[PDB]
């Protein structure tokens, strides 16, 4: 039912100063914290009201930890360059994502810690939280170091313990807005494409969480055969939006049905022109 | 709440 994720991104910009570092923290599909090396404070900033209530000791440590993440990323750029014999001049990216999921029962299910270089998988913690998938041969050298220093153990601890403890604290503290489900405000649009073809856009507006499935059917038969399907987009509202379109022979609209299934709807919905 | 577990690759 719930997760906490932290996403980190680190961009070497050689000749233009230290690398760019952006860090963002999510509970489900709500951002609560941020850090931007290029902003002014140089501190972990709040990004949802329910986190502003945390004490100086919190903000101190979060700042300390993220700075510690930047430095690690900053060195990582060096070593990864080295590992691949690349040059001082080119800009590379490092990404780190890590978090913990919980069930409707708010207990542990699953921990994860994934690490990319230039947008490819590079190293991941397994689901056993005890070993590593090392993609390349250079990742292999990373894995030996991470074994020799027991990073997996230490992560398993954080992932099964403090992570989930805090996620709970967060869910508690932000009930008014994190516990909500907002069902979609679905409707339908009709556009004359040809002399003989219409589009049917099936709209799902202003829902939370983000997770949603829109399908089309021609007389009950699950019609991907002409289905355009955009990415779940944010509204800014703290909601989400999505659509799905099918071109139909003009005059046979009435054989087509959109099927919207969100957490926030009792039973799957069905619209027809 | 962020980990302390970050290690030079």
């Amino acid at each position, epitope marked *: 039912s719930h997760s906490m994720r932290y996403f980190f991104t680190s961009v070497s910009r050689p000749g233009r100063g230290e690398p760019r570092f952006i860090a963002v923290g999510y509970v489900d599909d709500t951002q609560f914290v941020r850090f931007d090396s290029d902003a002014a404070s140089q501190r972990m900033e709040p990004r949802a009201p329910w986190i502003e209530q945390e004490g100086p000791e919190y903000w101190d440590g979060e700042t300390r930890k993220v*700075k510690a993440h930047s430095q690690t990323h900053r*060195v990582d750029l060096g070593t990864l360059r080295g590992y691949y014999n690349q040059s001082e001049a080119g800009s590379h990216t490092v990404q780190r994502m890590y978090g913990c999921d919980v069930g409707s029962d708010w207990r542990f299910l699953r921990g994860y810690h994934q690490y990319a270089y230039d947008g490819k998988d590079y190293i991941a913690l397994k689901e056993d939280l005890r070993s590593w998938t090392a993609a390349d041969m250079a990742a292999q050298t990373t894995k030996h170091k991470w074994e020799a220093a027991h990073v997996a153990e230490q992560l398993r601890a954080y992932l099964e313990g403090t992570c989930v403890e805090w996620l709970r604290r967060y869910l508690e503290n932000g009930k008014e807005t994190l516990q909500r489900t907002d069902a979609p405000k679905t409707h339908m649009t009709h556009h004359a494409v040809s002399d003989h073809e219409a589009t049917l856009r099936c709209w799902a507006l202003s829902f939370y969480p983000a997770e949603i499935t829109l399908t089309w059917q021609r007389d009950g038969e699950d019609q991907t055969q002409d289905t355009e399907l955009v990415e779940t987009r944010p509204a800014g509202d703290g909601t989400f939006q999505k659509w799905a379109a099918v071109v139909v022979p003009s005059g046979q609209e009435q054989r087509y049905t959109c099927h919207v299934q969100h957490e926030g709807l009792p039973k799957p919905l069905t619209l027809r022109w | 709440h962020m980990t302390e577990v*970050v290690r*030079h690759c």
Partner: T-cell receptor
Amino acid sequence: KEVEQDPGPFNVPEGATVAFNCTYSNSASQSFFWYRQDCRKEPKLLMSVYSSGNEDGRFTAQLNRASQYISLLIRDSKLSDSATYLCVVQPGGYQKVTFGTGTKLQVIP
Amino acid sequence: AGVTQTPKFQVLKTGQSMTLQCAQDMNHNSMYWYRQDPGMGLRLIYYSASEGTTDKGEVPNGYNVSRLNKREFSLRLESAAPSQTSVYFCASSEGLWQVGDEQYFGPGTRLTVTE
């Protein structure tokens, strides 16, 4: 001090097992080590210490976060083990490391 | 190799001044200067988390440092006092921001100041 250990010295017969312990104030403390230092020489890492007791040869180190101690066990102790053992903590990232005042071990033939 | 530290021994007249050198070829970010005295442990003097910055430790009174570069790190005695007789150790680590950051020590410098 963030760490305490007993100065000894502890006299153990050559071959016998010895056990060392260090306690620490701060439950948040993330990382731990034992260091070994010969008379008039420089500290050198012996090993790091995790909750999963790492038995490496004659040496075994234990961390107990619950109770806030770490231990070091030496089996089949040798004349060459006589030294001062230091417990060392790194609270967490970007925090100062503290070095224990050390336990002297003397191995007796 | 690892951490080198020079000189190994030194005498000094109360009021005299002098600077200890330390360098490391392990490509380490963080470097440190400590002194050792019976009864207490190592006491951190100053440290240099990274090539740019330095910062006082627990007992900086009497001392300064220069992070000359990613490699070397020097600790100066302005005017030696009799309370500065002790053993000094340089050390370095990949980076104090990481978990499990082992320190690597130099062989030390034994320092007597006399009347």
